[model samples]
Target: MQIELVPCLKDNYAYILHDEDTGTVGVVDPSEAEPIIDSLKRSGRNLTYILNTHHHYDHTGGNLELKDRYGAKVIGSAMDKDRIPGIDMALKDGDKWMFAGHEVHVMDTPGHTKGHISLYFPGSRAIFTGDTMFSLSCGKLFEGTPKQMLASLQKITSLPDDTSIYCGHEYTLSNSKFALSLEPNNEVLQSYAAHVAELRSKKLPTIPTTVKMEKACNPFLRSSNTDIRRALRIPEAADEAEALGIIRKAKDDF
Candidate 1:
């Protein structure tokens, strides 16, 4: 299986998951019909489904057109029920779908949008984390409260250490700058930012950072790291979750 990220409207990413052995492809969050159609034409494989993580326009605006053009199932979280356009399959938390012989587990991640869901392909060690987990940041608290967002983050962090995060946008460079503001002495952040800057200079996107790497450098995941706890003015975090809340609030305005 291979995942390709399609950049749309600035930083947004729409992914195309391909199962080369079976010649089946699944498009995740088709932001625009043209790009997705172009990808399908380029892949030269059968388009199987459209996985919509949320109802945001940038995420699902092209779902209708794609479904009409490809006759693919428009799958989304059942919580939205009717809000998502052309949802042929309304999946819920823990729901699993089989495509190209891989089982994709659905996780209800509702901070970016009330019905947002992440698709976890355990066999591939990848999770299509739509707008929830980024390289160094998560989405803003738009549809859920801080507490809910915290829980959502925990749900994502619970994935295996080797899990590769296929986040929905390319915001690493900007996020790294913000992280630097709160933790200037972090060598990991410094080196990672430098590498990210180099990548951005080449018009490359830095994504698919592993959970293990996240725990080491991503502030959202490393809020409990002693240095982060001190930088957040939390002298000491009783637990990992508390430190996370501190870092989250700091990032909100940074």
Candidate 2:
């Protein structure tokens, strides 16, 4: 299995998952049809399915077109059946299935949206996190609470530290700046930010961040750290969810 990140609609990222063994290609959250179609043609693979992580317009905008053109099945959260376009399969949390000979696990990650879900491929240690988590930042509280978001993040953290995070956007540069504000003395974050700057200067994408990397540098994931809580003025008495809420709110206004 191989995955390719395709930039779409400004900073958003759509993905192409190809399984050479089965000769099947899956498109994850296509912002539009043209880019994905272009990629499919370039790869010379058959489009088999459209995997949508949520009902957000940008994520599903290409659903109908791509499905129509390629005869691909649309799979999404059952809770969001009414919102997703051309949805053929309704998946819930813990639902596991085989796609192109690879085992796919469905994780219910509700934060950015109540019906949001993420697709995980254990074989490759990759998770397609639609909007629930970014490289260094988490998503905004659009349809869920801080507790829900924190719980969702905890689930992700429970995964293997080496898991590759294929998130929905190209927000690492800005998120790194925000993370540095709270952990200015963190050497790991400092070095990562500098590297991100170099990558962005060359117009490259800083995605596919590892769980271990985020654990060390992401402020949202490090809400319990002494330095972060101190920089954010979060009380030691606050719980994990409370500390996360404080940082998330701060990011909103940053």
Candidate 3:
């Protein structure tokens, strides 16, 4: 299995998951059909599926077009079957499916959207987290609460430390900036932020962030740290969830 990260409108990201041996391909949250179509034409492969993590227009906007163009099957959360464009397969959490030679594990990650889901390819140690968990930040609580988002983050963090995160946008640079504001003296975060800045300066994508790295530096995932709680002026006795809420609100206003 191989993956190609494609940039979409503004800062959104879509991914092409390819199976070389079978010449089968799938796309994750195609913001538009052009990129996926172009990629398929370049690889001379057929698009077998379109995987949507949520029903947001930005995430599923290309679904109808792509499915019509390539005869691809649209797969998304069963809970959102009506909202997802061109949805053919409605899968629930804990459902595992095989595509070509890849095994995908569906995880219910309802924070950014009530029916949001993340797809995990354990063979590749890669997970596509659509708008739920960003590289250095979590998604805005649009259809879900802070508790839901926190639980989602914790669920993903349970994956192996070496897992690779392919999020839905190019928000790492901004997220890193906010992270620094929360922990200006954090050496790990400081160093990582500089690295991300350098990458952006070179017009590179600071994505595919590793689980270990995010666990070490992402403010959203560091709620256990007293420093972050202190920075948010959260009570010393506040739990991780409370700290997370404060940090999220601060980021919103940042």
Q: Best lDDT goes to which candidate?
A: 2
lDDT of 1 by residue, 9-94 (tens): 87889999889688788888888888888877886765679998888898898888888988888888999869889999889899
The lDDT ranking, best first, is 2, 3, 1
Candidate 2 residues 169-195, lDDT tens each? 999999999899999999999999999
State residue 209's C-alpha deviation in candidate 3, in Å: 0.5
Q: TM-score, each model? A: 0.92, 0.98, 0.98
Report the Cα lDDT for residue 40, model 2: 89
Better of 2 and 3 by lDDT: 2
CA error at residue 50 for candidate 1, angstroms: 0.3
lDDT of 3 by residue, 110-166 (tens): 888899999999999999999999989999988998899999999999999999999
